[PDB]
């Protein structure tokens with residue numbers, strides 16, 4: 001199924017490419033032909049055409065293909081430089097978290113995992129569902145994207161709804177939902 005193969009693709013491209021013999025470049029790209037060979041170790045019926053179809057049909061824009069190169073657009077647990085197109089249009093974004101984090105966030109702002117990027121959403125429901133990954137008592141922060149930009153932060157379009165930014169200062173948190 002598309003779901004099973006996509007879940008494996010996301011694991012390989014975000015978390016464990018070397019386990020499958022793949023060496024991502026600094027931007028997270030691997031050869032799509034080598035990715036097919038890797039995936040076929042688990043699902044031998046997969047084809048390059050199938051992987052390209054998964055990329056084209058993905059509801060979140062999880063993946064990006066350029067020529068012969070494929071990457072995950074977000075969610076890596078290893079260092080990447082993501083030169084995604086800038087979101088210059090959003091006025092408001094959302095960050096899902098858990099209530100226990102408010103104390104720290106209200107003192108320090110939102111910091112990323114591994115000093116990478118903070119993940120934001122254009123959509124409240126997506127932010128809520130993301131926050132549920134860290135606990136049941138979810139709150140969604142409203143982020144003033146214009147004030148982020150005015151402080152010098154570039155907000156990048158990582159997926160259809162996912163946006164990434166280096167840091168969110170407390171001054172740009174405009175509400176809690």
Ligand SMILES: [Cl-]
Nearest residue numbers: 098099100137
């Ligand atoms: Cl909590």
Ligand SMILES: [Cl-]
Nearest residue numbers: 075130133134
């Ligand atoms: Cl996750």
